Design an enzyme around this catalytic site. Sequence first.
Site, PDB file in Angstrom:
ATOM      1  N   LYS B 154       0.805  -1.211   0.000  1.00 19.53           N
ATOM      2  CA  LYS B 154       0.000   0.000   0.000  1.00 19.53           C
ATOM      3  C   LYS B 154       0.848   1.277   0.000  1.00 19.53           C
ATOM      4  O   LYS B 154       0.777   2.073  -0.941  1.00 19.53           O
ATOM      5  CB  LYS B 154      -0.941  -0.025   1.206  1.00 19.53           C
ATOM      6  CG  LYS B 154      -1.954   1.099   1.271  1.00 19.53           C
ATOM      7  CD  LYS B 154      -2.889   0.889   2.458  1.00 19.53           C
ATOM      8  CE  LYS B 154      -3.863   2.041   2.645  1.00 19.53           C
ATOM      9  NZ  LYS B 154      -4.810   1.782   3.773  1.00 19.53           N
ATOM     10  N   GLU B 180      -6.138   8.939  10.827  1.00 24.96           N
ATOM     11  CA  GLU B 180      -4.861   8.235  10.825  1.00 24.96           C
ATOM     12  C   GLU B 180      -4.417   7.937  12.254  1.00 24.96           C
ATOM     13  O   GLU B 180      -4.871   8.578  13.207  1.00 24.96           O
ATOM     14  CB  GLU B 180      -3.781   9.076  10.127  1.00 24.96           C
ATOM     15  CG  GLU B 180      -3.864   9.089   8.612  1.00 24.96           C
ATOM     16  CD  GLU B 180      -2.946   8.058   7.965  1.00 24.96           C
ATOM     17  OE1 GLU B 180      -1.708   8.215   8.085  1.00 24.96           O
ATOM     18  OE2 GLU B 180      -3.458   7.092   7.343  1.00 24.96           O
ATOM     19  N   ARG B 181      -3.542   6.947  12.396  1.00 22.55           N
ATOM     20  CA  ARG B 181      -3.010   6.590  13.701  1.00 22.55           C
ATOM     21  C   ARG B 181      -1.697   7.355  13.745  1.00 22.55           C
ATOM     22  O   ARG B 181      -0.884   7.228  12.828  1.00 22.55           O
ATOM     23  CB  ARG B 181      -2.750   5.084  13.791  1.00 22.55           C
ATOM     24  CG  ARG B 181      -3.954   4.199  13.460  1.00 22.55           C
ATOM     25  CD  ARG B 181      -3.613   2.729  13.679  1.00 22.55           C
ATOM     26  NE  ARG B 181      -4.658   1.808  13.234  1.00 22.55           N
ATOM     27  CZ  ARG B 181      -5.110   1.724  11.984  1.00 22.55           C
ATOM     28  NH1 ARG B 181      -4.615   2.508  11.038  1.00 22.55           N
ATOM     29  NH2 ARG B 181      -6.054   0.844  11.678  1.00 22.55           N
TER      30      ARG B 181
END
Lengths: 94, 466, 469, 487, 37
Positions: B154, B180-181
């Site tokens: 990805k 997002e993390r």
Amino acid sequence: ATLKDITRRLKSIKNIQKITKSMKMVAAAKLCGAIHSSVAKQTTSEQSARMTAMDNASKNASEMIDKLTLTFNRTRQAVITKELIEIISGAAAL
Amino acid sequence: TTGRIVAVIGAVVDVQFDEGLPPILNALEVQGRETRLVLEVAQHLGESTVRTIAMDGTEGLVRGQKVLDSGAPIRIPVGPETLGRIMNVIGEPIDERGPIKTKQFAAIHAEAPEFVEMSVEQEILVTGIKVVDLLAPYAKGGKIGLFGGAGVGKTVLIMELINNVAKAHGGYSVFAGVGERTREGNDLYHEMIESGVINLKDATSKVALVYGQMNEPPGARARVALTGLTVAEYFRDQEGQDVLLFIDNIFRFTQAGSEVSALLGRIPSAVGYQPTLATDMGTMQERITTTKKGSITSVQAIYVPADDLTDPAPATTFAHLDATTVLSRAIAELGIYPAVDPLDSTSRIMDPNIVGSEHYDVARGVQKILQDYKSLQDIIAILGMDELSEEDKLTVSRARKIQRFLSQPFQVAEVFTGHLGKLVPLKETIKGFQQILAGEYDHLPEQAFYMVGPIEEAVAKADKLA
Amino acid sequence: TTGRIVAVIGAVVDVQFDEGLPPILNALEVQGRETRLVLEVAQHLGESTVRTIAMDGTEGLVRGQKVLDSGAPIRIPVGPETLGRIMNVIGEPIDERGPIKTKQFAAIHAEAPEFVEMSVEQEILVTGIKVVDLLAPYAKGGKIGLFGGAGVGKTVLIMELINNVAKAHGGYSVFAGVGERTREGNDLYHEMIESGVINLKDATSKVALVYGQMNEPPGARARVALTGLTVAEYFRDQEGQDVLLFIDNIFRFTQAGSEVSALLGRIPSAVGYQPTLATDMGTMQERITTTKKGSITSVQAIYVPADDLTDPAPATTFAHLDATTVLSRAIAELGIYPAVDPLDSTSRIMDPNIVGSEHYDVARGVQKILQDYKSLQDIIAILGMDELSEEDKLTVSRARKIQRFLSQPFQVAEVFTGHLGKLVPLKETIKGFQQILAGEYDHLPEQAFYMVGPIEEAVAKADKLAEEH
Amino acid sequence: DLEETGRVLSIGDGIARVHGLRNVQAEEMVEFSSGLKGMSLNLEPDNVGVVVFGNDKLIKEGDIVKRTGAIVDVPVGEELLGRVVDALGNAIDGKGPIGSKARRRVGLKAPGIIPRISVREPMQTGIKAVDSLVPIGRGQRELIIGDRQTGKTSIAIDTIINQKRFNDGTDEKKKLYCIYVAIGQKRSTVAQLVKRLTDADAMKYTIVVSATASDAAPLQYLAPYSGCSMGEYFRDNGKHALIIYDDLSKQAVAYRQMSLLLRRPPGREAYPGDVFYLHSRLLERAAKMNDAFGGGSLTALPVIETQAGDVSAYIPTNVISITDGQIFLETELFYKGIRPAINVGLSVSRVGSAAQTRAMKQVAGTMKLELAQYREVAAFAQFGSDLDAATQQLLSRGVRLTELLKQGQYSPMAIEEQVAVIYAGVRGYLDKLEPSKITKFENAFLSHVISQHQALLGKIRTDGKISEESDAKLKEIVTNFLAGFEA
Amino acid sequence: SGDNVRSSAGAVRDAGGAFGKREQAEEERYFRARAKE
Ligand SMILES: Nc1ncnc2c1ncn2[C@@H]1O[C@H](COP(=O)(O)OP(=O)(O)NP(=O)(O)O)[C@@H](O)[C@H]1O
Ligand SMILES: Nc1ncnc2c1ncn2[C@@H]1O[C@H](COP(=O)(O)OP(=O)(O)NP(=O)(O)O)[C@@H](O)[C@H]1O
Ligand SMILES: [Mg+2]
Ligand SMILES: [Mg+2]
């Protein structure tokens, strides 16, 4: 329909599905359709038929699982939707 | 005009303005805080009182605390100097590389191009990546659903695309990390730096980063997709470019939406989503298309809830997609990269009237030979791959050459792969596979097509390896 | 202080005080009634008005009716003199045996014993039920949970646990009826009167009764659990003595509250239960435990709506237990009693370093062969009993026997099975399954192990079975 | 003075409606006449919806509510090590008071994206399944999820036990301080939970926060954070802390209760709309800080109780996303014999090999690809009455390796002790031995190496991998020990 | 998923059937043998 029941038939038919596919291969390597059927009513063949039988049986289960799962989610969505409307009617009744 | 906070219930805040009342979507600035706390207008409750959704914590707020009407909605820095920089929801740099010195600014809330501003031509955005350009072309100004969890290539396919589009189209790119993390957000930043797409020294950066961390409130996480959207719009309406917008997890945008919706006390629709689902998805998605000036194509990573394609979220998202890039571990294992599934990835534009009859019949031939080879697998293993007719022995072989020719070495992999990346033009890919299908290259070994670029490098690689 | 009723909707009544406002959890006496009517202060609505749940019917209340604040929470009679007496929810005696002249009254509402008060001792408590003591052993002074869908054996099982462990208990035992059938109250009472666990002519009675069954409005069922718990509290502290606490269906404590939530003005939560479901259950369970002052060996019967264990009520009740015995319609349906699930009943002391290695291995050995047998249920579901290698079909044949040997006639269930209830010692249970897993009894028919006591009767029955053929 | 103080308008279900306090801040503490604390979640025009910490029987209408100014804070530092406390730092073990030498706000902003650095340093659980197939790095947020009584907790207890190894050591850079946050459990269990950690002399470096089933809703709601804080003290001081939030599921349940009692807007499963914002801010608070900030880390292990395994359910979904990975537990694998009950196919750490020393990296992979290939032929197992040599061989390794994964609870092992046992498995030595014996082998095999081959273990660690020499040292140790095993 | 089949109907009565039938004769088969011994 009931999530509990569908989940039961899916698991159960996913299992059957696995066992039938396994039998199709064994047969391939080596119930045999209407083989024993014909001769009584009246190997190469025997295995032929068994290969075929489990094959179809394998597909017939997958086509069944494919239909149960859709019913799974439809019904999964419905239950959430139901639980929520109940939750709000009570709140809007306060 | 100045208002006074009169109501705070979590990420929801109601402010009373005595005179001038701030329109809906207008950003208000909370006064008296260390960091900047923005409140986006959402409703006019009446009695000079307006309701809002905070873009950051609301701890500390007090009833009566002053609040300032910024005059317009949330405005952020736009223009070249945003590239390489990591922007916050409200426009603040969060890469600590100081200010984002821009002369321009824009509102995150902008109506989509009008009907006349619409492109009526169906053009294909060349990525230079074989499988993509051949089996599931990226509609220029279209949305593409990126399917595949993690550990499938990805982050590499994302940057490569950034690279290619830059090299072969001059357009930049923006990355909107929705929900997002912080961890992967950091990992991505450096993984990009060491890839070239971002340069902390010379202005050669090709991508602008925009983040919406999970620790950030639903209000914040809901607007990011727009902030990053506004950024990309500048490069399309101002520099006539064919930008590329990356929304990792369009789902968490949706969810972000429902949470805002609920917080605002609205009655959820089926499956708990927001009534506004389709419109929330409409207003944003529609700001992504081809305009007379240029165009923005966007690759949005998608999460299918409970593996249910019919769940509202995705199903509402599939209405806006023109293509889907499906990554597969099954593919990644075989060593085939990119691990794009040649049979599950697809395109609406993959039509003769659009990609040309020639291009069409090729993509189709490859899809059908793979389909044929994928079936054979049974017989080959069981019945033995010894009783395969002439037509059966060629399929398996050719299919394998094709299947591997579908692999491509990325320029962004050079850093580790130690192999010059390749950018294949649409022309080369069509003919490449067009021939393989004919049989012109049947007198060659498989590994010859594995990890190469144009069809040439296939034969050249063949002789060397003999 | 005197208050006036200002609103009556079901079990929810609003009382307005002009003088002083009673604190929450305070019991209120409704004047003008031929039967004491207690109103528990649940909330402070504001404007000198409190909202309260009625501990009885509201049929007949009048707006403006007087209400005397008793000053404190519901206080009931506790102490030895309760033994043999059937108590109400508000301490009233309901055996028609007159008043319960007690010298001390405790509030059914109280804080839960601190953490420093917790006991870490664990001594297996033998019950004579092979399955229980085998797979998920109960523990002395622990919290026992008995889960089960409608009519699978919760009531009969808890009854066996009283005929087995209570009768031979050197101490007091409390039993609380929580929203069940009044007929079962009758049964239990007269049956305890027979066994002599209850004496109507003297003071040897060793069990106290508390009841608030189905015919009772939710409010009551919503507190009786706490009532009975209070009675057993006194026996745990003011003595230290060992106490056994049986509550038939704590689930009626959460339904009770689920039947008055809305009327208390509460948005409903998932599955209609109260939002306070888990914490109400918490300030209720934590109280039913063993402290360093004394020990409570509790056995609660837990209902499971539609048989779904994931239902909030039961799923929230598990962690409160140190040992769980789950009943299974599926099992009961195969005529196996107690219908205990071998694969879903667990216990905290099921550790080799508490029951030894021999006891443990056999237990897991049982569970495993039973899980393997479930795996073959499928395979043979399409193939038939003639495909399994002589090795597998061998385990199937042992599964059946081990499955059947888990069933056991109950002294309390004679009237049902028609057989003589047996009682198995622990050791005879392990041996029993140790040998079957060994392969020893592979020559005996399954039926030989169905409904018996120690492994011997099996062989014996098996013999009585050979001769009859 | 409706400015600094207020009066209670109403009080019901831990939700006191307060008039006045026009100056309190959103999320500020306050005191009631009776001295109880109360958080201020809802700030309204006409009122302040105050959340009550403790039974409400003490609060009546009218009761005064003065501000505390002092935001919600909890004691922090080493003096809590070995002590069991409630959601608010109060000691509850009666061992006496704690040496509160420093306090820290429970509601604090998590570190940004720049104060961090990737996850590299391993977070040894001591569990052969986890450390070999689901590796955890310091700074990581790994989730333990599965049904009830499936062993979720037993993954956290051992992993803590495991820490003694390094704790009583001299290598201070490997030291890890533990924090077990119990949410909604019963005092009973905690007390057993503690004795264990103590009878194992682990409590000496472990912190216990307990908001049991009787503690008020908001107490259970805070403990997770108040706990995360205690771990951040170490996170900000170069030290590394592992925090375990036992079922956030229960915390969510408490939050909802307060939410619905204040009458906010209910959504799916009646949970408030920001329930996600509740766990996201708590889970991000964990991090592997950069050498510039000290190098300290706060590793998190929240627990999620699923129902019938439904992970597509609201909160499970939530957390699953919020965190970095999952170790899935299951009943079937349990009563089957597979203990711990981890599903190698469903469990996954995104951090993978990053926090897996080369010593482990080698053996792992091969096993992986093998447990995988075994995971395909699985079905054919019992029905393979003529299976070719190939599959029959895929199944064999299959059963062998799983038995290996069987580990004892309260019994974690050093990464090296581990690789040494995986070794004998992956190389095929157990491929002849009867299935039911494998276990008894690892047992007699491990004790042995540890007993007569310490330096050999050390060499595995040191060499970072399986050296050509050590690979030789083991091949002979196993062959010989093996052979003697089946005599 | 262990024994989903049996936890239903159609094919369950079958598995249930074959099952009992088998062990039915078997045991009788083992029954007289007990006498022998
Ligand atoms: N040990 C047993 N032996 C034989 N039959 C039993 C046994 N236990 C229960 N039963 C049967 O099941 C019936 C009632 O079970 P019971 O113990 O009352 O269930 P329950 O779990 O208390 N149900 P309920 O409380 O109504 O949800 C009896 O009338 C018997 O027919
Ligand atoms: N590796 C192991 N070997 C043997 N038994 C184990 C192992 N790990 C856990 N157990 C046991 O399994 C049981 C339950 O696991 P536990 O640690 O309580 O899981 P849980 O998910 O926390 N259950 P709960 O939270 O009470 O619903 C206990 O009796 C443990 O002793
Ligand atoms: Mg009953
Ligand atoms: Mg647990």
